[model samples]
Target: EASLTGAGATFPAPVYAKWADTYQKETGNKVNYQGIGSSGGVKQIIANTVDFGASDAPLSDEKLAQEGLFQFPTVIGGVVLAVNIPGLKSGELVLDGKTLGDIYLGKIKKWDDEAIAKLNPGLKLPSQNIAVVRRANGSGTSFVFTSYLAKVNEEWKNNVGTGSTVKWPIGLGGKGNDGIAAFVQRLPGAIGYVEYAYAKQNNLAYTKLISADGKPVSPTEENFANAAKGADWSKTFAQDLTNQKGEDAWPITSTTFILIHKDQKKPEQGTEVLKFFDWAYKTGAKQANDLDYASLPDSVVEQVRAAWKTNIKDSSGKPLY
Candidate 1:
C-alpha cells in the first residue's frame, strides 16, 4: 500500500502526530504529516503538492469552487491567551475583547495599563513592558483571534482587521504555534495567542477570557462544544464553522479542515490519504481529547462524511476511490 502525505496547520500537529503513530500501528500503513501553517496547506492542496493539506481556517466557498477542492472539518479547538508574566498565575489575567484588540494593535503596551487592570480589580499587575508575539506565517489561528477583535473594536475593524493573515500593528513574529509558545515561555512579560493544547503541553500560563455571557472560560471540550452550539452544520463547507454562536461560545473557537483534491493526480496516494483520515475518525477520538482537541460531534461527523461523499469526486464526477 502507498503511504500518505499531508502538510499544514501546526495547531493540530500534536494530535495528528499521535493519531498517525497509532494509526500506523493498527493498519500497518504509513502516514507522513508536516506542520506547515494553514496558508501553506491550502496552497499545497491547490497545487497538488501533497495527498492532503490541513488548515485551521476553512477556505472560502469561492476559493473552493475555483480550485475544485474539497474540505472537511477534522477537529475543533480554541486559541488561548498565553502569557509569561513573572507574578501572574494561570487564569489570573483578565481581558475583554476591545482591550485585547488594543493590545494586539500596539495601542496597549504595558502590563499595568489601566485597560487590563480594570478587568481585574484585585490582581497586582506588573509595570514591565509587554511583548506581543504573533504568527509570522499565515495562520487560521491568527484569523480567529483577529476576527474576534474586528468584531468588537471599531478601529480594529477598519484598520487592522481579521483574515488568514493580518497586518499586525506591533509584535515579534513567531513561525508557528510552537514557535510562539516557546518564544513567550522564555520572554518575561510576553504574551501570545496559541492553540489551547500548546499552552497546556508547554505548561505555559494562560488566561481564561470572560465570555460574552460574562463567564470566565477556559478552552475545554465543553467550552468548545458550547461554541459550536447553534452552528448550521448544513452550511459548513470544508469544515469552516467560524460563525457558530452561543453565549458561552469561546469567541476564538475554530474548526480545522483537511483539504484534498477531487481529481487527485496520483490515485493510489489519494486513497491512502483518505484512508488515513478514515482511520482517524474511527479511532482517534480518544487521542484528540488527550491532546485538548474536541472530537467531532456525532452529528457533525455524519454530516462531514456525507459532504466528503458528495464533494470529493474524481475527474469523471464519480466517487473518489
Candidate 2:
C-alpha cells in the first residue's frame, strides 16, 4: 500500500489524473498528483516535499546537476491559441506565427487587423479589441507558448524571449491553464494559450497555426507526434519541439517531463514512483491518446528505463527501477 506523490505541469494534469486513477485501481498502490505550475513543482521537489515533479520546461543538464536531480520525458502535448469570439468555431481562425506574436506583443490591437485578415481571408472577424490573456503563475505551458513565438517571430525573440516565466508586454493574466481557459471562455475577443485538453474541456475555440513547413495545421495527437519525431533525447532530454519542420507538425508541440532526486531518501517511496512510471510507459498510451497527448516513443521509453536504472539510486545504493 505504498502511496506516491507528484506535482507539476497542468499541461499534462488531465492525463496524469487518468493514469493515476487507473494505476491505483489495478495495483492497489496510490499515486497522488498536484497540478501546480512547473516552477512550483520544481521548488517542491527540491525541497523534498513530493516523490517527483513534472514540468514541460525540461531542466538544463547544468541545472539538473546543480539540483542533484534527474529527469525524463513523460508525454507530449501542444499549446493552443484558445479564443473567445462571437460565432467563431474551433480551428476556423488561421494565424501565422508572426501575426500571433504581434498580437502578444501588443502591436496588433484588434481582431480584424490586416495582419490577421491576410492569413484568414474570407473569415468573419469582429471589430473587437484583441484581449491577450497570459499565465500569471510560472508555467511550462507559457514556456512552450513563448518558445514557439520566439522561434518564429524576431520581435518576440528579441523582446520577451523564452522562459517558464516572462514579463508580458500586454493583456490580462490567469493563474494556470485552467484559469487561462476560464478567462478565454468568459471574455469576448480574448485569446489565451493553454494546453489542448484545457481548451477542449472548456469548450473554447482554438485557432489553426501555420507550421514551420509553411502549411496550416490544426492541433491533433498525430500532429504533436510529428512535431516530437525529431527529439534527440540522448543527453539532457531537453530537446525543444517548437517549430518542427513538417507539414503535419503542430508548431507548439512540447514534451512534459518528470523530475526526481538522484539520491532517494526513502527507497520504498522511490521504488513506488518508478513503478508508477513503469506501469504508465507500458500501459498508459491509450489514455494519453484519448486525451489528445502523444506517448513517448518506444525507443525513448527504453532509454528512459535505462536512465532510471543508471542515474537514480536509493540511499543504500540500489536502483529504484
Candidate 3:
C-alpha cells in the first residue's frame, strides 16, 4: 500500500474526500488532500512539495511542459450563486449575467434592485442592502465564476477580468469555498459564489441563473455534463465550459484537474497516484455523482491512461503506471 499527498482546488475537495474514503477502504492505500486554493496548489506542486496538485484553471500545455508536469481533469462541477436574503430559499431567486456582474462590480447594491427583482418576480426580495462576499484566497472557484461573468458582460470583462483571484471592487473576503459558504450563511443579504456542493452541504440558498441559451437553469450533475458536452476533451481537459450553447447547461461549469510530474522522483508514489485515479475513473463515478460532480467520460479516461503510460516515467525511464 502507498501513501500519497495532494493539494489544490477546494472546488473538488468534497468529492476527493469521498473518493479517499472509499479508495482507502478497498486498497488500504492512504490518500490525503488539502483544499488549499488552486494557486497555492500550483505553487506547491511546482516546488515539488506535494505528490500532485489540483486546479480548476488548467495551465497552458506549454507551461505544463516547461514545468515538467502533466495535467488531467478528475471531475466537473459548477460554481453557483448562494444568497442570504431574509426570505429567499434555494432555487427561489433567479439572476442573469448582467446583474450578477454588476453586483460583484459594486454596481448593484440592493436586494430589491430592479435588475434582480425583475428576474425574480413574485419572489419576496427584501429592500436590505446587498452584502457581497468573495474569496480572499487565490481560488479556481473565483476563476470559474468570474470567467462566466466576463464572457457575458463586457463591463466586467474590461474592468475586473478573469483569474483565480481578482481585485474586488467591493465585498467581504472568505478564505475558501467553506469560508464563502459560512459567510453567506451567517450574513443576511449576502451574496457569494461557491462550488455547488458547498452551498448544498451548508444549506445555503443557491439561486438559479440564466444560461447562455437564454434559459434559467439550476446546478445539477446532468446540467454540468451538458455544459461540458461541447468540450473537445481530446486536446485539453480544461476546455472552456462556461457560456456553452446547451439550454440545460449550467453556465459556470468547471473542470478540476490533477497535476503530476512528468518525471517521477519516486516511482512507488507515482505508480500509486496513477492507480488511485485509475480506480477512481473506473469506480468512483457514483461517489462523484453524489457530490454533483461529473466523472470524466470513458474516452477521456482512456486518453489519460494512455498519457500516463507514455509521459510519466521513473528515473530509469520506466512508465510509472
Candidate 4:
C-alpha cells in the first residue's frame, strides 16, 4: 500500500502514533508520519513535499492567504513549565508569564528570585541558578511559549519576538519535547517547556500558570479546552488564545494544527488525507484523551471539515471532502 506521508510537529506524535497504527489496521492504508518539528513541517507544506504537515505554530492569516494553504487545528494541548527542583512538587510553584519571560531572557537567574518567591510564599525555594532548557529545533512548543510571553511581557515583545525558533537569551538547547523533558529530569535546577504529554508521561514536575482571569490553573484537558473557547472560528484559526480570559483557561494552551495544500496535485492522495482526518476527528477523540491530548470538540471539528470543503480542491476546482 502507498502510505500517506506527513511531516511535522512532535506535539501530537504519541497520540497520532497510536492513531496511525490503528488507522492502518482499520483501512489497510499506512500513514508515514515524521516529527520534524513545527518549522520543518511548515516548510514541507510550503515546498509541497508532503501529503500533510503538522505544526503547533498557527500560520498567520496573511501567510495562509499568500501560500493558498489551508490549516486547522487537529488537537488542543497545553505547553507547561516543567522543572527539576529537588523539593518542589508539581503545581506547588506558580509563575505568571512576565517572570517566566525574564527568566528566559536571563534576567531572572535564581530559583528563589523575589518575583517567583512572591507567587508562592510559604514554600522553601533553593538559591540555585536557574538552568533553562529549550528546543534547539524549530518547534511549535517554542512558538506557543514565546507567543505567550510576547503577549504578557513588553520586554519580551520588544526585545525577543516569537517564532518556532528564536534567539535564546539564556539556557541550553535540546531537540524535541523528549530531549527537553530529559534535560529537566537529569539536570537539577533546570527548567523547560514541553507539551503536556511529555510532562505527564515523563513524570516531570510542572508548574501552574496564573490565568488571565487571575486564577492559577494546572495543566489539564479541561483548562486547555477553556483556552479554545476564546477562538471565534467564524474568522480564521490564526487568532491567539494565549492568556485567554477565563477562570479555567491555562495561560500557555494552544492547538496543534495540520497544513494541507489548497490544490491537490494528487487528488486521490488528497482524498485519502481528508478521509483519514475525518475518521480521526469522528473516531479518535477517546484515543486522543486517553493520551492526554484534547481532541477538537464535535462542533469545531465540523467547522474544520467545512474549511476543507471550501479550501482543499482538485484540478477541477471542486472540493475534495
**All candidates: TM-score:** 0.94, 0.98, 0.98, 0.95
Ranking by TM-score: 3, 2, 4, 1
Provide the global lDDT of candidate 2 against the true structure. Answer: 0.91
Residues 98-118 of candidate 4 have per-residue lDDT tens digits of: 888899988999999999899
Each prediction's Cα lDDT score?
Answer: 0.82, 0.91, 0.90, 0.88
Deviation from native of the Cα of residue 61 in model 3, angstroms: 0.9
Between prediction 3 and prediction 4, the one with superior lDDT is: 3
Candidate 4 positional error at 3, Å:
0.8
Where's the lowest-lDDT run of ten residues in candidate 3?
230-239
Residue 124 of candidate 4: its Cα lDDT?
90
For candidate 3, lDDT tens digit of each residue in 4-89? 99999999999999999999999899999999999999999999999999999999989998999999988889999999888667
Assess the local accuracy of residue 300 in candidate 1 as a C-alpha lDDT between 0 and 100: 78
Give per-residue CA lDDT, model 2, range 258-278, as digits (tens). 999999988889988888899
Q: Which residue pairs in candidate 1 have backbone atoms (N, alpha carbon, C) closer than 3 angstroms, thus clashing?
A: 71-238
User: Which pairs, if any, clash in model 4?
Assistant: none
Worst 10 residues of 2 by lDDT: 228-237
